[PDB]
């Protein structure tokens, strides 16, 4: 899709526990195509991001419980320049939020929660589809700007959210992912690099 140098990290993982980020962001080098986010406790980074070794003063009785079940958690693999795949190695399910998956289901952006089954190996992100969809937004703006969508709206296209154990959505007591006892937000770097490029082509000309 692009020619400029590949990113140092192919993604960033931020663990959460409700509306609070617990622990510090995990950066996965591009040299580590597959990363594991389990509920175990090995501090050494590398290919494993152990959520079980993250502390939190706010942590409750209900979260200590859920965290106990993360297990081998899942895996995040980078295949083609910016394509991500997920494989649930956990005994429990995992809930993923993906536009590539929403589109594939004929659903509207963000109007669906995808439950992955243990042992499942599904594709959750297509760099090209992302890149396309960006210019898609940049175009209509250049238009709605001359006829008369921000960085936070479109950066979502380069983001992935995943809740371990508990699920949210329109069929669970939890309405938003900021209500699950433990989850993570993944930022795809390549998708962001392409976005940095696209952002420069949205003639500021927005007016104040």
């Amino acid at each position: 899709i692009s020619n400029h140098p590949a990113p140092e990290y192919w993604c960033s993982i931020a663990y959460f526990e409700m509306d609070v980020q617990v622990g510090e962001t995990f950066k996965v080098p591009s040299s580590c195509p597959i990363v594991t986010v389990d509920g175990y406790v090995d501090p050494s980074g590398g290919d494993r991001f152990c959520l079980g070794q993250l502390s939190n003063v706010h942590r409750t009785e209900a979260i200590e419980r859920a965290r106990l079940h993360i297990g081998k958690g899942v895996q995040l693999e980078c295949k083609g320049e910016g394509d991500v795949w997920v494989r649930c190695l956990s005994d429990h399910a995992v809930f993923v939020q993906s536009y590539y998956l929403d589109r594939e289901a004929g659903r509207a952006p963000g109007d669906a929660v995808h439950k992955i089954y243990p042992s499942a190996y599904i594709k959750v992100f297509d760099l090209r589809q992302c890149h396309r969809q960006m210019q898609q937004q940049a175009a209509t703006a250049q238009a709605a700007a001359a006829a008369q969508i921000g960085v936070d709206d479109l950066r979502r296209l380069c983001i992935l959210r995943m809740s371990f154990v508990k699920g949210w959505g329109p069929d669970y007591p939890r309405q938003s992912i900021k209500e699950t006892p433990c989850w993570i937000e993944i930022h795809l770097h390549r998708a962001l690099q392409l976005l940095d490029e696209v952002l420069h082509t949205m003639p500021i000309a927005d007016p104040q």
């Binding site: 959460f16 980020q21 960085v151 950066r155 770097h189 690099q193 940095d196 500021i204």
Partner: protein
């Protein structure tokens, strides 16, 4: 070797990881490049509890501000199409107004936000004043900047924590010199108890 670290805030919420500047001239913008030792891109920093105003203001950060280390001085050039407000106790104390003074930097402008020699001289005469006087100089090693919205004297946003998007700069150079003095200032006057 980093001459300064930068922390981004949204109101009174610390958002994102601390950026460490390794390049003598960098930029803090509202874009999304995740790996530029010369670009602290705020656009890629999330905030699960981000409101509309913040989100709206982030849109106008644009090319943001360009900070840059010429010799022993730091300059801030507003690249954004919106103004950027600076609160530099080292810059204010130069023009004279109450250190908490915020100075507006219109688009296309640039201000000298810090001067080493000045600081060093202020650190020297402080030693005679006492521990307390030296301990407070850490504020002199800090600089706060807001994007798009202003604050302080008569912008009815009296404190930085009121602005939607602001950033704090810690000058490592000055902090290191302060530390060398501090470890020699002895002990505080005013004491304290373990129970109170």
């Amino acid at each position: 070797a980093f001459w300064c670290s930068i922390a981004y805030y949204e109101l009174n919420q610390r958002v994102g990881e601390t950026f460490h500047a390794s390049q003598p001239s960098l930029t803090v913008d509202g874009f999304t490049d995740p790996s530029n030792s010369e670009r602290f891109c705020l656009g890629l920093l999330s905030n699960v509890n981000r409101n509309a105003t913040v989100e709206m203001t982030r849109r106008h950060i644009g090319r943001g501000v360009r900070l840059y280390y010429i010799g022993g001085e730091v300059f801030a050039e507003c690249l954004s199409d919106s103004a950027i407000f600076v609160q530099s106790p080292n810059c204010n104390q130069r023009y004279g107004w109450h250190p908490a003074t915020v100075c507006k930097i219109p688009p296309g402008c640039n201000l000298k936000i810090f001067n080493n020699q000045e600081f060093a001289a202020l650190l020297a005469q402080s030693v005679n004043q006492g521990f307390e006087a030296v301990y407070q100089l850490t504020r002199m090693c800090t600089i706060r900047m807001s994007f798009v919205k202003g604050w302080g004297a008569e912008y009815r946003r009296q404190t930085v924590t009121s602005t939607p998007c602001w950033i704090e700069l810690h000058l490592n150079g000055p902090l290191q010199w302060l530390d060398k003095v501090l470890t020699q200032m002895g002990s505080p006057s005013v004491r304290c108890s373990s129970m109170s």
